[PDB]
Amino acid sequence: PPPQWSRRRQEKQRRLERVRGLADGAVLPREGLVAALEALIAPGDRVVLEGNNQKQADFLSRSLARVDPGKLHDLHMIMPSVGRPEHLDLFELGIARKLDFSFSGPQSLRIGQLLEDGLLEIGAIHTYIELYARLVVDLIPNVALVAGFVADREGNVYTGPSTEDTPALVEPTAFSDGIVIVQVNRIVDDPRDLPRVDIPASWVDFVVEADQPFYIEPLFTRDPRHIKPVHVLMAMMAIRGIYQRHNVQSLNHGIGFNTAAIELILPTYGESLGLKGKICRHWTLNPHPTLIPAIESGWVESVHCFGTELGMEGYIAQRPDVFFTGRDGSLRSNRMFCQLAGQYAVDLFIGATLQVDGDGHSSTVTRGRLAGFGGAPNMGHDPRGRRHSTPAWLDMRGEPEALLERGRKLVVQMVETFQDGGKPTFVERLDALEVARQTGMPLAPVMIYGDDVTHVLTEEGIAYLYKARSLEERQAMIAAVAGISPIGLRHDPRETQRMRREGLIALPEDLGIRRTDASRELLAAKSIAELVEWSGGLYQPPARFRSW
Amino acid sequence: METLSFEFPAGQPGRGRALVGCVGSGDLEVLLEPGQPGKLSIQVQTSVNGSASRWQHLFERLFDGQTPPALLIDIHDFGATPGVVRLRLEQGFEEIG
Amino acid sequence: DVARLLALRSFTELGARQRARALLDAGSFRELLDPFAGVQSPWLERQGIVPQADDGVVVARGLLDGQPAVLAAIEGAFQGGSLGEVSGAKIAGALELAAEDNRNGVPTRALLLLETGGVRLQEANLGLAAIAEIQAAIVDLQRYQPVVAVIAGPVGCFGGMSIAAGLCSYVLVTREARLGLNGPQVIEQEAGIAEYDSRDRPFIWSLTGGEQRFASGLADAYLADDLDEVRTSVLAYFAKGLPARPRCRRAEDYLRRLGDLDTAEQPDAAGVRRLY
Amino acid sequence: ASRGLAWFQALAGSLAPRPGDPASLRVADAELDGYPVRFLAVVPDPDNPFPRARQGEVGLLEGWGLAAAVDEALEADREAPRKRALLAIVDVPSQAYGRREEALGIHQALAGAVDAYARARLAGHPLIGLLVGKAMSGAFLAHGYQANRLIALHDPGVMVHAMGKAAAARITLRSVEELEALAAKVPPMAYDIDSYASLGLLWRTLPVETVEVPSTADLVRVRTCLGEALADILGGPRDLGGRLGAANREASARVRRLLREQW
């Protein structure tokens, strides 16, 4: 295997001997970790650091911050999610310089600041599956810093309900002479104590028994107490004006209280329309605790999960018919495989957002705050490569016996006319435009493009954009449901009846929904506690949501 | 915080009274009493400053082509969105009938 | 002879849906809001009145000489052909959509089979609002295509819809059809048995009958009660297009003639044919 | 002689009838905030050629007469920079009920009225119907229901319907007692203006100090209202689509929608 053709293998080889003394086998000493990190990583390395929507490799993540900024500099950080503080710390300390991410958690006012100071450089804002894809083209990685639960001395890792992005972050690293380090909660000397092998040992280079269990974020869990009756009003319009009017059989729900509202009034408002089993049978969704009554009411046939919501593990093991579980009994999430399904195999996507302009362009990026896109761009677009027909997919066709006209994925943008802080949601210009000029961004960071949205859903009503004959007509429809926001003030009210009759928009009246019928009494579960007892004690909410 | 006053052409005095919501952050409280015939007098106390123009549009739309009963409406707003506000006004107006 | 008598093909002997299918070109008939849609009157059950599934009106698309058309037939059996909230909106909304077809290039014709007692008094104000919208849409449409009104009887055409009949370009009638504003009983009621007799059937037809209305110019065709002959006359009038100057815009000629008449005494069937 | 007549002189100034109009009509051009306005009203004429039309009824003459006055103003502003608005003061107890009337085609007379008003509305003329008294059946179809906007005075004398309870009870086969009974349970059957309002056919109701003869206070609120109503009309859709907003007309709206889906 010739020298000039195997240079990154000899480089991996050089790196593994500068820790051959410090490590016995694949096992690394917890209190000599930072030493190893300075030996296995080189300055300028492309590093994948597990900051997943949920699973965080917090021990590795912290130890890498207490590295010496003289030995490791100009690191290129590749993280699906930037939630933890240690993460952006790598940049102020001068250890890391470039960042390629997808989801920016709370860290959004920071990333923006650190960037404006010239400490952090951004490649672009991706959408998970896009960023994974890069790892075998543009951004082949050098080091992978991931996390699992258990590992044997051989290298086999059990990632369990928290598999998430690991199989996609590790594979392009292991097979390109890169270096894979996985922190685990426990090493077993006897391998038959590994409930399952999620990552084969031949992908892993070293394992570390962490100083404490890897941090799990309940990213998607929503307290049903915070669901107001305005949420419940939109939830009803979604179910009758969209799910039912198009016969949606499968879907994904974007994070947010708005879609939590939908999940929780299915077994009541959905039931009162005799829709149990007629819609929403298949899901590409995280195991949302707000979905529990819908499972028990017997609505949900299948659920394939991106990750796991902390506390839902035990509930899921007890529901093998619904979730995808291993032969060990526990969940096997797969954010790459779920994300893929959420694009190609699912009828609809529905999610919230922070801003929309008159053209329907949606984004989370606002003044000096670089929010992430998460999974929204992958599921918030009409998958142009899809060919397989489905009922809902076909309903979008204008002339249904034009054989050349293809169908469309339902892409719903579900938002109140106003963000709570008295800012309007529908604005004249996206903030994202100005953030682009001041970041040398080549094109404004839009999460979901206006031409991709089929339904705009508001407490005002539904705009069936998929029916728009021209852009001017689309803008007309958006303003009609846009309330008293600056976009909605463009709308001339005498024009509403026309738009209603023509079925361009639907008011709640048009759906047989009296607005004042929206109350929390429709919520199947009214609190986190009520969620625990639909689950019959199986859901163990994390301390954050407990009141007992 | 600021105090706003409104007035609209209305019909005959409404028939009863009504209370809807509470002054918690993000919600509002609406008092509906019967008032002087021909006039609908609204009084708004909001925690949001310079929203006056916003409340104006909300109300014009609410009463567009539908003449309301003559009422006295006392609103106490702790930064509720125009969506939530509109919703509680309708709850309130429904209960008055 | 006897074979002819045994072979009569009466038009009035058909119900609303039968008339509709019978006039519209063979095979084009497509009913909108059919009885299986179950779009019925929301005001009848509460009053202890049994509702009809299509509220007493048949609205159907199709062709009239390969020309796109819409047809609204009222069913006389149901509440006398009275229009209610839903009944009315089926007719008005159809004329409104025919008009919007003309504005988008499609030359849609509107054929109305009127067998009605006017506003359904059990839905009084909602049916009367509807007729106003029916009227409005008839005018709006006759800027592009004529509306042919067919009044064959038995019930005839009264109340608000007699005013809607007036608005129409052409008004084809049979002998049995009546066309008045107020029904005979209603006049007797308000004006006295001497001023008008609800039991005097030959008198009632003598003034408001299809024959009388045609001989005085308040009607454009005096059809026999034969299926084929009615379709024939229908197709023919749609083919003449919009009338040069229709009865509605003759306001001063009639005002002139009325001014001439000595109103001091009760005009008779013949007196009315002379005055025009 | 009638609320119509009282309110015509109070809004138009001219209380005498034009020459050329039947004595039962009252036409008069004027201005309303610098906008050209023609006031039309049907009033009583106890010396009407037809006896069955001497208490304000809309009969043969009143019918065609209206078709005259509107078509008159239609061709005037055929060219004018601003089509003049038509304000209909509605206060007509009924259609004329009679032999003389039916024999001469009273249904056709009132069709001339509807056609006129309608063609006017369609051309750009702003119609406004001011319900100051009674507004019944065919009479109101002719004089009033072609309006771009309806305004009623809030008052017990203001009633909308299609037949007197005497005749309605007869045709229907009910007692006057069960009508008034039913008229509370079925809003479209009721005569009062509150029940009419619930049909969302009125753009505005406004109460007054003295309905019989407006006070200077009334006449200013009414005049302001017409001004506002007239501005809502201008530049917008000319159809009667505005009459579909109410929950009691829920079905009217649903039918028009289903019609387009299957069209």
Ligand SMILES: CC(C)(COP(=O)(O)OP(=O)(O)OC[C@H]1O[C@@H](n2cnc3c(N)ncnc32)[C@H](O)[C@@H]1OP(=O)(O)O)[C@@H](O)C(=O)NCCC(=O)NCCS
């Ligand atoms: C239409 C009319 C002339 C026909 O009378 P006819 O030929 O003698 O037939 P009938 O009197 O048997 O009428 C039959 C049915 O029509 C019904 N009907 C007629 N007009 C009706 C109306 N406007 N509302 C409700 N029902 C009506 C009658 O109640 C009767 O009911 P039934 O079928 O349960 O027996 C007569 O019903 C009439 O005078 N109608 C009044 C029309 C009118 O003036 N309209 C005012 C409202 S704008």
Ligand SMILES: [Cl-]
């Ligand atoms: Cl996800």
